[PDB]
Symmetry: C3
Subunit: 456 residues, 3 copies
Amino acid sequence: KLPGDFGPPRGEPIHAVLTSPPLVPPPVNRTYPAKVIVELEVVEKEMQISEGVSYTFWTFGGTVPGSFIRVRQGDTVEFHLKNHPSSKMPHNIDLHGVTGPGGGAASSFTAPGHESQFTFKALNEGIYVYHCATAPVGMHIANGMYGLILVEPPEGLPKVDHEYYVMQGDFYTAGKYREKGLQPFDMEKAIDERPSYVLFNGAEGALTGDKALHAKVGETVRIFVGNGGPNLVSSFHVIGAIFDQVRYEGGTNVQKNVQTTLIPAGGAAVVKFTARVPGSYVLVDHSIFRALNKGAMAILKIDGAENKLVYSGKELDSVYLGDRAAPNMSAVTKATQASVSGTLTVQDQVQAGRALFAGTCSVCHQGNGAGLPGVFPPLAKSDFLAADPKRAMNIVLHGLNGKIKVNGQEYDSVMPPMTQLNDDEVANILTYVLNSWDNPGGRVSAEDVKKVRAQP
Amino acid sequence: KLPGDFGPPRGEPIHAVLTSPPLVPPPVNRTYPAKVIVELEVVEKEMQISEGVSYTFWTFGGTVPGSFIRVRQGDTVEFHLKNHPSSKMPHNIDLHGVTGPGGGAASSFTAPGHESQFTFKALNEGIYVYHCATAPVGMHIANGMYGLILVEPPEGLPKVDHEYYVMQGDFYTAGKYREKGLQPFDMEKAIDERPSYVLFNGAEGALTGDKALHAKVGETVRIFVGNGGPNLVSSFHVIGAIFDQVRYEGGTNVQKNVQTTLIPAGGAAVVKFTARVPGSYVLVDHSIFRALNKGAMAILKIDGAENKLVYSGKELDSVYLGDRAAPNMSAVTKATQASVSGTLTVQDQVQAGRALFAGTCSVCHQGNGAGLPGVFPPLAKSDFLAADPKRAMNIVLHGLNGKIKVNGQEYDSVMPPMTQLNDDEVANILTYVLNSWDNPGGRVSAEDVKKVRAQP
Amino acid sequence: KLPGDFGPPRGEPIHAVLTSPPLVPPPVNRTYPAKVIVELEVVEKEMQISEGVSYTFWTFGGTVPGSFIRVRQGDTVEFHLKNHPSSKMPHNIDLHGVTGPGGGAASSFTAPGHESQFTFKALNEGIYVYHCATAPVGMHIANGMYGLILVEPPEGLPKVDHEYYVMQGDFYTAGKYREKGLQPFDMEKAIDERPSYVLFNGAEGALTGDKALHAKVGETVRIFVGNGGPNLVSSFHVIGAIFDQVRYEGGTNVQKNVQTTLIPAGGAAVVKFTARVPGSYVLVDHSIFRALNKGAMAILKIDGAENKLVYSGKELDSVYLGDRAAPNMSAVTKATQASVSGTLTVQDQVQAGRALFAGTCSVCHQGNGAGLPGVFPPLAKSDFLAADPKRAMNIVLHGLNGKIKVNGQEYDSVMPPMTQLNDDEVANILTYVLNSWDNPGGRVSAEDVKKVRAQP
Ligand code: HEC
Ligand code: HEC
Ligand code: HEC
Ligand SMILES: [Cu+2]
Ligand SMILES: [Cu+2]
Ligand SMILES: [Cu+2]
Ligand SMILES: [Cu+2]
Ligand SMILES: [Cu+2]
Ligand SMILES: [Cu+2]
């Protein structure tokens, strides 16, 4: 007998309602197998991969990851793929969980402006990645062509308070991390498995700040977690919490009470979380430079009463979360646009710099620039800053050590170089500082920084 | 008590019959512990790692992976390692599953032209990697010195219709992927874990096309899957199917009903597959640039009747499998040899280009060069191609965008650069196209392409 | 109900006794929940990451990994973090296993010369990584800021004969592997996940030779194994043995009878080993260039009677373990210091070269330099060596092939290049050889090698 042998489809054909991340369709809530009609459209479009950084994404349903599909084991799925006429590339689909060559790939080949269809029976319960399977496949996947399909067990999953959809991917831009402008795909970095960004849900900050996932103390949360790759394996982890359950694909095995779990490239898992105490819980790839240097962080924010018997401490802040502690970094987007338009004002720079100062600089110099006397020198009303703005550019790029005097006090410490900051970021940060805390005002330009970077 | 305590060896000494990949020795089919004599010979030799690409492999038994060894838990194994007189390096062996320092390494050190032996009891059931353990060990492993030993449980494994032997490895050549000639090992790429090839069974195409694994609808297939490394961890996956069972080494844990599973460097697993519907099922490392850009694909081809209730779609083709959809790429080998000999003909180039055109170019331009009017321009009887062959070289290497006119119709799309193609590959592809579909004939040489690559 | 609901703390407050690697605190041996006071101090200090190679480590408790903390599920932990006044950076802590945002991070922020405290209930049994969580977090982790906390189940873990503490990390120096001197952290290699060293317990040789872990035949050994990362996933493996049990974090799953197991970045596991036969058992990351080219090897040395029925072979030697077979490589440290001081003698070089010759050269040329007539030429009383010392430098760096005559016998083989050896290493090795085995004496300097490396 084949698995999923629940007989022919019955009832009426069901048009599947698909959802955009990070939301999930409702439970199927059905006791009979059905014919389920799935309609998905490929759209190629520019979107912001980071503030001020555009990328040409290739998408299933207009999002990265693509629309979530939810069916029942034993269903007959009539899958329709449409390729929007604006597309330049052909596309197709391989759904993990399909029983048949290519997971649908040969029969779903769809040129721009065309449609295709194929039918499969969902024999296999589980959570599964789907992705494009069009040569060059790695390029298509790298450009965002992946999503999740859930094939429910016949009785449904246990009830929870919230269900969310989170998918990791690695991305390959010609430019470096946070370098502004429309960034091409970089095939050489992709072949070498050297991503410039590693993201949840297609963008930096997609699930942080005002875009966080939400729940309340006492509630249960199920997260459908994909790893589209193309190349990286996620050391997937929740900061400050534990997973009650982790189940990979449709596996019989269920691990319970783990905090860190390896998700293969192309893999998927269902995790369950129970909210205990309020605050922000961070989903990360614990290959930690991905999480804290390339974008791979997402937030589940829990509302409710503190329990000092369980945890006496404070909510997360910019020391750990960096510049993603805040609701958003919209000022960076605005300043980048203003630079393109040739209308960049001092205030545009100040507000972008404010956003970027958090964590990056405030960890040592404090959010108010006061530092810590004799330990971390002040940026507030700083004589040393005022005396030489070009020196300040060199300090950000190249670091500073040795004995200095600031506001009448000696320091003898080490500020590491921060050369990974882009010219606009340094410029904006320093313009923020110059226009705060009784400093002398004025501005630093990206071009000013470019010149210092070329001659330390 | 130690595990495997089934008493002293009984019966007669058994000379083990070892098999070359992808075949496996028969089940031991024995109820008593034996003394098993294993004889393995190291041979260093050039073989083709890809068509026209030679490599000096170091082998156990003349193959990569090395010969498969099959014994029973509780057996006493008298292991004999011989190092062929033609060898330049000394060699030895570490068998995972051996209880004792180095897994045999110190007592198996064997200079060229020598032999060694040691004896161990197989206490531990499971599937296990063996490999060379001679300084510099990573070099020996990278050169192909790894294989599998199966230690059966006393009652044997459950009966299946087919057993196969598949082992992943990462390889490090001085040249780039598909660059022709005898390629040295590259220690710098090896230390950086930046392989040029990632392969099953020692070569591109080792298990594709006419070298695929076979079974029929309804049959069960057990695959002994190794990962020799040296360095990579496989996101091991079957496209279009599921694994009934995955069991690592001799672990008590068995995962069931998973499609994607992580195999450590040095690790091994036993997977089971049940054939449901006909077609080609692809074993891959789903760190997908390895599978589709570096060689890490293998095929299990299933014969039998379609079942439209389960899968309505078609067999895999070159859109997904690329140039490995075909039975073989022997024409590439032949053309590379003819170049070396100084006898390369137009037809030699045409037949190599034909092989290389599949997927790489046909995904957009079609197998007949017709394209799709207004979407993908024709290569068949193409005025634009004929008008400027050097332009065509530049388009392959460097891409093309913007409005063009071909055969009286405007196109306004994007052909990505294909700079990873080697000079001979571009030359051969374009010579194929020029000599097909009423195009004007002639040829493009590797030297012609080299010149365009040096000045875009 | 929350997990760990064993009621309020009772008895007296307990001041936790923390241990330095590779030792573990005693079992808590307690049937009631307690208030446990933990005091940990951050110290930034230079230590030797390899012989003659200094690094500025940032530590919890003065060691890498940091001090081991051992508590009972259901305990209330009052955690005190102090930052030594000599520190330049602020620090904090995220303990995996803590229920609360950041795992303690916001409330543990501690500037140099300050202290902080927070309280948490240990709801979650398991073995857990702790680490610094101060921007830039990856830098702090890379500099050594990680350790383990064990939260025992209420009944305690089963009794074993020995408990040890082993933690992997990846490290990023500006210089190459084994390049001498004080090495800065390299942010570019860290972001690219390209470590120069991969170590157990903070240094090359930390757990080899005279620093090996010990047990006797018949004894059980539990190892608490961490992977601090920041970035790598360990293919964690024991050479020549098997793990009776592997349990990750506080997971319900326990794998039994495996040799190779994947430990995520940030992950931890408890493994159990039973000693069967004497000799050295190697813990490695089986992404094997890490183990054999970057430092990722540790030894469990078992004392007792051989059992020829189980294993007939010899103890590990330098063929497999390389230059870590010996008790230590102190002579390298001494020679590097003498170079810095300008007092380097011939004998200083000879003794450093002796240490470095093992495995690296002896695998082929033998420990006595005799080679194997006609196969591996002698370095003992070698006419060919004596005839041209600069040629010998070129051979080490750049290899040698083709027909040569040494001591009246022809060789026609291949010595691979060894360009990864640093100038001082080549110099010292060759000075050792020149001053051994009736060779002519004299010396080779690092500067001599530098010149040959610049012009092959
Ligand atoms: C802690 C790790 C720091 C971070 C992050 C940043 N800075 Fe810093 N800064 C730090 C120290 C210890 C010092 C003094 C070094 C010494 O030689 O003793 C400094 C110094 C500066 C200065 C100059 C002095 C002053 O005006 O107070 C400037 C202008 C400065 N730092 C700016 C700055 C900015 C803009 C940062 C974010 C990009 C930043 N610093 C981070 C320590 C640390
Ligand atoms: C789809 C992703 C493509 C692949 C793969 C290949 N080509 Fe292509 N090609 C494509 C487009 C959309 C265009 C037109 C670009 C525009 O500006 O609108 C082209 C064009 C060419 C041409 C020139 C026009 C013609 O003669 O039809 C040539 C000679 C050409 N392409 C060759 C070619 C070859 C040999 C390829 C495999 C190496 C190949 N193309 C791949 C789209 C795509
Ligand atoms: C086996 C893989 C080797 C290792 C490791 C090392 N050497 Fe070697 N060496 C080897 C061979 C096969 C040869 C001869 C090459 C040929 O063309 O046939 C050599 C040669 C030398 C020589 C010159 C000849 C001599 O004096 O015997 C020297 C000086 C030499 N080798 C030194 C040397 C040192 C110092 C090494 C460790 C750094 C070393 N070799 C490693 C094979 C192998
Ligand atoms: Cu696509
Ligand atoms: Cu896939
Ligand atoms: Cu070998
Ligand atoms: Cu091994
Ligand atoms: Cu720190
Ligand atoms: Cu962590």
